[PDB]
Design an enzyme around this catalytic site. Structure first.
Site, PDB file in Angstrom:
ATOM      1  CB  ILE A  30      -0.955   0.033   1.208  1.00  0.00           C
ATOM      2  CG1 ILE A  30      -0.145  -0.053   2.501  1.00  0.00           C
ATOM      3  CG2 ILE A  30      -1.956  -1.092   1.108  1.00  0.00           C
ATOM      4  CD1 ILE A  30      -0.914   0.310   3.736  1.00  0.00           C
ATOM      5  N   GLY A  31       2.152   1.155   0.155  1.00  0.00           N
ATOM      6  CA  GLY A  31       2.995   2.329   0.216  1.00  0.00           C
ATOM      7  C   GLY A  31       4.469   1.996   0.239  1.00  0.00           C
ATOM      8  N   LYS A  32       5.292   2.928  -0.230  1.00  0.00           N
ATOM      9  CA  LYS A  32       6.732   2.745  -0.267  1.00  0.00           C
ATOM     10  C   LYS A  32       7.403   4.073   0.042  1.00  0.00           C
ATOM     11  CB  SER A  34      13.317   6.925   3.023  1.00  0.00           C
ATOM     12  OG  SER A  34      12.389   7.506   3.921  1.00  0.00           O
ATOM     13  N   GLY A  36      11.131   2.073   4.018  1.00  0.00           N
ATOM     14  CA  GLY A  36      10.886   0.730   3.542  1.00  0.00           C
ATOM     15  C   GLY A  36       9.549   0.630   2.841  1.00  0.00           C
ATOM     16  CB  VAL A  38       3.045   0.703   4.308  1.00  0.00           C
ATOM     17  CG1 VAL A  38       2.173   0.506   5.540  1.00  0.00           C
ATOM     18  CG2 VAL A  38       3.961   1.887   4.502  1.00  0.00           C
ATOM     19  CG  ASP A 152       7.082  14.752   6.671  1.00  0.00           C
ATOM     20  OD1 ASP A 152       6.764  15.807   6.082  1.00  0.00           O
ATOM     21  OD2 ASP A 152       7.351  13.693   6.069  1.00  0.00           O
TER      22      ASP A 152
END
Ligand SMILES: COc1cc(/C=C/C(=O)CC(=O)/C=C/c2ccc(O)c(OC)c2)ccc1O
EC number: 2.7.11.23
Length: 337
Positions: A30-32, A34, A36, A38, A152
């Site tokens: 579902i996500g990428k 730095s 790593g 998800v 962030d």
């Protein structure tokens, strides 16, 4: 790499369908980033969908994830309803030389919500709900035993609980840090970077308030308030709206000479930026023109007075001075709420 489980960039190769520890059934990626990856996975033991942050098989990524795990556990140790505006770490474990952080699966981020609208933004009432929840979350972070800077804040890191409801949760505490253990400069996303960070000053929990200001403006207008492409460009687009910063703090700015000359701006060459303070929020929001795009004319909660209260709250949140910038508690007491 790692018996064929990792690869280049030290990332676990996600095979859709694999089972972990007879518990987690990896659905998808579902996500990428730095950090790593998800993955969406199914907790068969608790019978619920979870997100798993799989951290890279590099040492420093592991140490950063361990800082994040300690911060998240410290947040879990404080029993108050405010903590429910933070993403909940369900579990952390080591699996095949990867630190894995289990989290609640939530809906889509606020940038996805902006994209569902044709970047027309969301109503000022929904912006008000989001702002209240965000100020409550920052209040929870402001707890002295916590004193956590998210470092962030951005629409992509504010997710919706349910897609039909208005509840939100802030995520991605990878870049986060406690007020004492600040470990890095160049901390925030550019559009939402506070001024003190751009000027290399000792930052604190007010940078999140600056980010929240830019985020609320972007939520209502549909576009980033400060869409800077580099550091100096971001600072110039900031000054376009807020004028030159209080020298009282520039007399203490290490990177002051990167944008200003002793105190005024620097020549371009090149179409000049709008003179300082000329781009008023008033016109960006459209306080007297029916809101962004003249679409909110006559809508309840979108009167000229409501837009003026929102303008005052945003300016209180976009204060150049980190010490006078509005704190979460007093932000909650604002007339906009
Ligand atoms: C409704 O549609 C979707 C929803 C999601 C939800 C995202 C998460 O649930 C992720 C989550 O909670 C993770 C939180 C988290 C928490 C801490 C972190 O450091 C971090 O690093 C990226 C992430 C995803 C895709 C979809 O298509």
């Amino acid at each position: 790499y790692n018996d064929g489980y990792d690869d280049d960039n030290y990332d676990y190769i996600v095979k859709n369908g694999e089972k972990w520890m007879d518990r987690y059934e990896i659905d998808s990626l579902i996500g990428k980033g730095s950090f790593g990856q998800v993955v969406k996975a199914y907790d068969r033991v608790e019978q619920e969908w979870v997100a798993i942050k799989i951290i890279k098989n590099k040492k420093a990524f592991l140490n950063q994830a361990q800082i994040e795990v300690r911060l998240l556990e410290l947040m879990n140790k404080h029993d108050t309803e405010m903590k429910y505006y933070i993403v909940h770490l369900k579990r952390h474990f080591m699996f095949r030389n990867h630190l894995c952080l289990v989290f609640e699966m939530l809906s889509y981020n606020l940038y996805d919500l902006l994209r569902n609208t044709n970047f027309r933004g969301v109503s000022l009432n929904l912006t008000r709900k989001f702002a209240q929840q965000m100020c409550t979350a920052l209040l929870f972070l402001a707890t002295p035993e916590l004193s956590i800077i998210h470092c962030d804040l951005k629409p992509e890191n504010i997710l919706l609980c349910n897609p039909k409801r208005s509840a939100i949760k802030i995520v991605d505490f990878g870049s986060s840090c406690q007020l004492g253990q600040r470990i890095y400069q160049y901390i925030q996303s550019r559009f939402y970077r506070s001024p003190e960070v751009l000027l290399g000053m000792p930052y604190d929990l007010a940078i999140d308030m600056w980010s929240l200001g830019c985020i609320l403006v972007e939520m209502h207008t549909g576009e980033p308030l400060f869409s800077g492409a580099n550091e100096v460009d971001q600072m110039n687009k900031i000054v376009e709206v807020l004028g030159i910063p209080p020298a009282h703090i520039l007399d203490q700015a290490p990177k002051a000479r990167k944008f200003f000359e002793k105190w005024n701006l620097k020549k371009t060459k090149k179409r000049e930026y709008k003179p300082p303070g000329t781009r008023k929020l008033h016109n960006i929001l459209g306080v007297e023109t029916g809101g962004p795009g003249g679409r909110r004319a006559g809508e309840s909660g979108h009167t000229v007075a409501d837009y003026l209260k929102f303008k005052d709250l945003i300016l209180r949140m976009l204060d150049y001075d980190p010490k006078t910038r509005i704190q979460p508690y007093y932000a909650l007491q604002h007339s906009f709420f």
